[PDB]
Amino acid sequence: STAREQPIFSTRAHVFQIDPATKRNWIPAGKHALTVSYFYDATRNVYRIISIGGAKAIINSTVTPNMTFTKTSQKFGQWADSRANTVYGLGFASEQHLTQFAEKFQEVKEAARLARE
Numbered sequence: 001s002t003a004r005e006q007p008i009f010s011t012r013a014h015v016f017q018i019d020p021a022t023k024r025n026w027i028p029a030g031k032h033a034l035t036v037s038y039f040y041d042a043t044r045n046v047y048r049i050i051s052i053g054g055a056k057a058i059i060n061s062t063v064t065p066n067m068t069f070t071k072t073s074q075k076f077g078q079w080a081d082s083r084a085n086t087v088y089g090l091g092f093a094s095e096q097h098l099t100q101f102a103e104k105f106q107e108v109k110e111a112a113r114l115a116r117e
Contacts, residue, residue: 003042009104010037011097015051015058016089018078026089029058036090036101038063038108045115047108049088059088065113069105071098079105 012033019025030053039048051059061067061081069079075098078089092098 006040006042008038008040008047008108009100010035011092011101012036013090013092013097013101015053016091018087018089020086023087030054033093034058038104040111047112047115060084061088063105063108063112065109065116067109069102071102074098077102 013036014031014033015029015036016026017029019027032053034051034053036049036051036059039050040046041048047063049059049061049063050057061079061084064083067079067081069077071077072089074095075092076089077092077098078087080087090098090101092101
């Protein structure tokens with residue numbers, strides 16, 4: 001619990017990102033399903049969504065007080081990251097998995113809100 005980086009939640013999902021030019025077409029990021037997790041950075045007092053693929057951080061989004069995750073199908077969800085200047089999309093294996101990720105997003109945003117004070 002005293003770790004610099006504390007794992008919070010991990011799940012599997014295929015990752016995508018909206019095309020930066022028109023923000024209409026979805027572009028797969030790392031074709032295969034990857035582990036997507038929420039971590040608590042005790043060094044910066046922030047929560048982050050991280051996903052590693054091909055020795056690269058396909059996702060490293062800091063969860064801010066007004067960042068929102070929206071379900072756009074029964075198994076897909078997305079969120080805009082204004083800091084990173086992109087939009088991430090996740091395709092889960094089931095509706096239950098999407099629900100799990102979304103509920104954790106909300107629980108973690110609450111922390112960020114209090115974290116911001």
